[PDB]
Design a protein around this ligand. Structure first.
Ligand code: 80I
Ligand code: 80I
Lengths: 299, 299
């Protein structure tokens, strides 16, 4: 019964709008009297090679932006730029605005994406911020402005806004203060992601889940120090494990009676010898987007 | 990128309530002026072993039901049993009632589940009705009354309400008329489902999904007959393929350009020789919980 789950999306659906600037349309996020969207909405295809966004913006007026919340048209009172985001002040304050916060997600953590097209929600799914600051998403044309989030209690933490697809098929975007994750820039360019690495904390959580499921062929009685495990991990493009990660795994360690460093010695052997066709939780590939929190929450 | 995706759950979240009867609480679905929930809310531990629900319900009155829609308590005006569901009439009609229908879904079809606890939505995910009429869901204690659904245009098709977990960890429940899917009954007894099989139609749709987005490595130049493929299907516990199924795969066959019986030959090879450590859509197993409809909508 281990599956990826998304947070319920209703609180975010109530904030999704459409923003149109001439020929280009995309999604924006309506909280109180401000609408947030990618700033490349003001761009033409010609402007996309090397845009001067401050120039492009001064040449726009409030009336240049068509903002539609479903049926209603909203009147843009003012506009400003915040990093790679446009902030549109609007006539009307969103009655559906939830309690919210803007957070910067860290590599390895997960969030739900509400994929939207023309301001209309289309689907929800879970994904993770990769170590190389991309996300392996599902985005078609028209998805820019779609938002990633977590929900704790009744408060929505917005963490991601979609901007771009890279030639490798992965996706890039910003936090809700308009700062890109990673070295990417909002212009058509030859940019490519760094070498991705595997989220070791999450592979270890997945192995604990596999043991909880009654799968423990990979266990052994070797010992490893944290330092010696980290040296092998990096050879195989796995992220090194920090002290904090070891403590994050404490609850799963106690539930299974497998010491964290002993699970690390199990993983070290999988890296060095491969699986030899055997499966773990049905797969020959080590899953790395299930967090320790996901495992404990589903037991 | 190709992921399992759930419908946005906003329209369903507005319908979720909490129903308590003595010391037992679960989720209910509030549409217009009636609340639907599993009838075993009226049960105790001793009753759950072999209950007579007609007897237990004649002994209750409207006062015996506390229905909470967030902060507000709704007053129960009437009550009746419909198969394995209770129907509670309440004085207030739900203003957030969407356009909706009750549908009984067929084996092989998919839907989203809004997993709820104490009337509070907790997560959303996609799953399928298995050929043996169970679902492989993620349901913890307190999730009874959680609902499965699809959305088309603005209309919510409710198809599932959650009732129980089988010893194997799969889940069983009813349609919104209260009739169980499968051979199960709502008593605290150990119950077996029939032997499951793989949903062939869905594996084929997913192979088309792989061709549309990305890899064709598993394709070959051969062909098979419907009858000769089904001979391979039975040996591997796959559902036999019919002509109607082939008619369904028409549009996917046209967009990709691979005839349906050619894709069957590719599948027969994958079953006979395994995947030799290769991956098809980031997966090392043949995924069978995407319908043809799901693939087209996501492309
Ligand atoms: C030379 O240029 C390229 C070369 C090779 C690969 C490339 N990839 C991207 C990109 O990733 N994204 C943006 C614009 C870039 C130029 C800033 C886009 O082009 N379309 C989508 C998002 C995309 C669409 C499919 N999946 C997505 O994530 C929007 O949502 C907003 O753009 P639209 O208003 O719909 O045109 C540009 C690019
Ligand atoms: C000894 O008998 C058994 C043997 C072997 C397997 C068994 N399985 C069940 C079962 O599932 N029983 C229903 C109660 C009815 C059908 C009689 C139930 O327990 N449902 C849970 C949700 C479940 C809990 C964990 N995952 C879920 O899906 C509630 O949430 C409501 O119960 P509570 O309100 O929490 O007390 C009984 C049983």
């Amino acid at each position: 019964g281990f599956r990826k789950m998304a947070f319920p999306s209703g609180k975010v659906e109530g904030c999704m709008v459409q923003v149109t600037c001439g020929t280009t349309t995309l999604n924006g996020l309506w909280l109180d009297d401000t609408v947030y969207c990618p700033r490349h909405v003001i761009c033409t295809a010609e402007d996309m090679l090397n845009p001067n966004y401050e120039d492009l913006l001064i040449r726009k007026s409030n009336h240049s932006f068509l903002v539609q919340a479903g049926n209603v048209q909203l009147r843009v009172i003012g506009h400003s730029m915040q990093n790679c985001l446009l902030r549109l002040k609007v006539d009307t304050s969103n009655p559906k605005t939830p309690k919210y916060k803007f957070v910067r997600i860290q590599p390895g953590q997960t969030f739900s994406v509400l994929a939207c097209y023309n301001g209309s929600p289309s689907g929800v799914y879970q994904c993770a911020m990769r170590p190389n600051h991309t996300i392996k998403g599902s985005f078609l044309n028209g998805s820019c402005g779609s938002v990633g989030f977590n929900i704790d209690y009744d408060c929505v933490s917005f963490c991601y806004m979609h901007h771009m697809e890279l030639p490798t098929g992965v996706h890039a975007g910003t936090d809700l203060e308009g700062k890109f994750y990673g070295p990417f820039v909002d212009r058509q360019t030859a940019q490519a992601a760094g070498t991705d690495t595997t989220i070791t904390l999450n592979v270890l959580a997945w192995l604990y889940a596999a043991v909880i499921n009654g799968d423990r062929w990979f266990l052994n009685r070797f010992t490893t120090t944290l330092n010696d495990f980290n040296l092998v991990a990096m050879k195989y493009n796995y992220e090194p494990l920090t002290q904090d990660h070891v403590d994050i795994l404490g609850p799963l360690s106690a539930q299974t009676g497998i010491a964290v460093l002993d699970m690390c010695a199990a993983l070290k052997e999988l890296l060095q010898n491969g699986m030899n066709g055997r499966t773990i939780l049905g797969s020959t590939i080590l899953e790395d987007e299930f967090t320790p929190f996901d495992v404990v929450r589903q037991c």
